[PDB]
């Protein structure tokens with residue numbers, strides 16, 4: 015007894031810390047930069063949609079104005 | 081085959097196969113019948129949602145715990161909980177697995193006998209064994225001595241053990257536990273305007289207690305500080321909005337543990353029943369018990385309790401002895417980890433209550449040599 | 452977050468173990484030095500008794 | 507961030523302080539123990555010469 019405390023504690027004392035650091039690094043890398051880039055891409059597409067909407071609205075208002 | 085280490089508890093049922101690190105399925109032990117009428121046809125509405133399913137439909141249920149203070153008050157509901165645990169959370173038929181239940185100290189005999197009778201007749205297990213909830217928590221710490229304070233959610237008990245020889249005359253069982261703290265918190269929240277009454281809102285108050293409350297190192301200084309500054313007021317968002325702000329209710333709810341006069345209980349706090357439990361022991365093993373005080377159970381997870389308790393005991397104890405409080409990070413599942421370790425032992429493999437033995441002596445076999 | 456708390460807990464386990472070992476060693480030093488000085492006093496009394504016997 | 511750095515550094519400092527204090531205490535314990543052994547060894551011979559003197 016009291017000799018399995020080493021073999022159940024020291025293991026996770028380093029392996030768990032290193033593995034969680036690895037998980038945090040990979041999750042941040044996968045998540046944050048890709049999300050910001052994708053949001054910028056969607057913003058550019060949204061601006062293009064806004065331009066298309068403005069053009070169509072203006073041309074239809076020009077024709078229909080009677 | 082492998083053994084099933086179930087642990088009924090009172091508030092959270094923890095179960096899993098023997099030999100692992102953590103319980104496989106942990107879910108509240110509540111059985112809630114619906115209370116309204118119900119107009120949709122064919123919706124597939126059941127008559128009783130148990131376990132973690134009734135913590136999601138709790139808006140239209142009346143949850144009721146089947147275990148009040150360690151003892152079991154509603155046997156049909158407890159049978160339903162066990163059936164759910166075996167068949168849906170573990171999906172292993174009990175006909176092929178030994179079981180290791182756990183029971184608080186100083187409980188009524190009839191409860192234990194009915195438990196074994198159910199396990200042998202309804203579920204028809206091969207062999208079951210009942211163990212005291214504190215010896216397991218001592219197993220999990222890897223010690224062999226020490227006095228363990230297992231403050232669960234139903235009942236707080238304090239079993240001292242030396243060199244493997246338990247001291248039956250020094251067990252101090254006190255019935256203040258997490259549930260009474262939930263009720264007291266729900267009662268002092270009314271001083272700001274928030275009223276929780278329904279049995280469903282008791283769960284919300286429990287969540288508030290878990291996430292916000294903490295044990296003060298010194299009570300009077302905290303009461304004075306919270307009454308002048310506002311650095312303590314932490315806010316919390318209800319399940320529908322309308323955030324609430326908890327002031328000095330934060331450290332007044334768990335203070336009831338050290339002053340049970342708050343909820344009208346006469347007895348002394350958990351800081352003084354441990355010292356009394358030690359002083360009943362012999363004069364030559366008091367140093368070891370002082371040095372190996374073990375904490376377990378859910379309710380001992382309050383942030384800052386391992387320092388308050390040490391300060392209190394150091395105040396009570398003689399100045400020469402060293403007071404050390406073992407507070408492992410895996411406190412909540414300490415009893416179940418110990419249960420897994422005990423069930424995995426080879427020396428223990430012949431202590432099970434085999435079914436043929438029960439057939440020969442009846443349910444009263446549990447009080448006999450097979451304890 | 453998640454890993455940060457566990458790393459803090461490891462740093463705290465090291466704290467408790469190191470502090471406990473330091474305190475225990477300090478108590479050991481106190482006890483051992485008291486033993487040595489009491490033995491030295493016994494030696495002194497023996498020297499004085501030898502002196503009386505010589506007289 | 508800010509909190510992680512200061513807390514981690516303070517805790518590592520606590521561990522190092524406890525360790526070095528324990529090492530100093532154990533060194534003094536070993537030295538005192540050996541000196542105590544010397545005191546015992548000399549005291550035995552002092553007793554022997556005292557016994558001869560008394561005879």
Ligand SMILES: Nc1ncnc2c1ncn2[C@@H]1O[C@H](COP(=O)(O)OP(=O)(O)O)[C@@H](O)[C@H]1O
Pocket residue numbers: 088089090091092093231232233234258259262286289290291377378379381382412
């Ligand atoms: N993190 C926590 N902080 C404060 N209290 C907690 C925490 N987790 C659980 N509790 C309290 O402990 C109780 C669960 O205790 P538990 O050890 O599951 O009891 P049992 O011995 O019946 O298993 C809950 O009702 C809750 O009030």
Ligand SMILES: [Mg+2]
Pocket residue numbers: 089090213230232233377378415
């Ligand atoms: Mg328990």
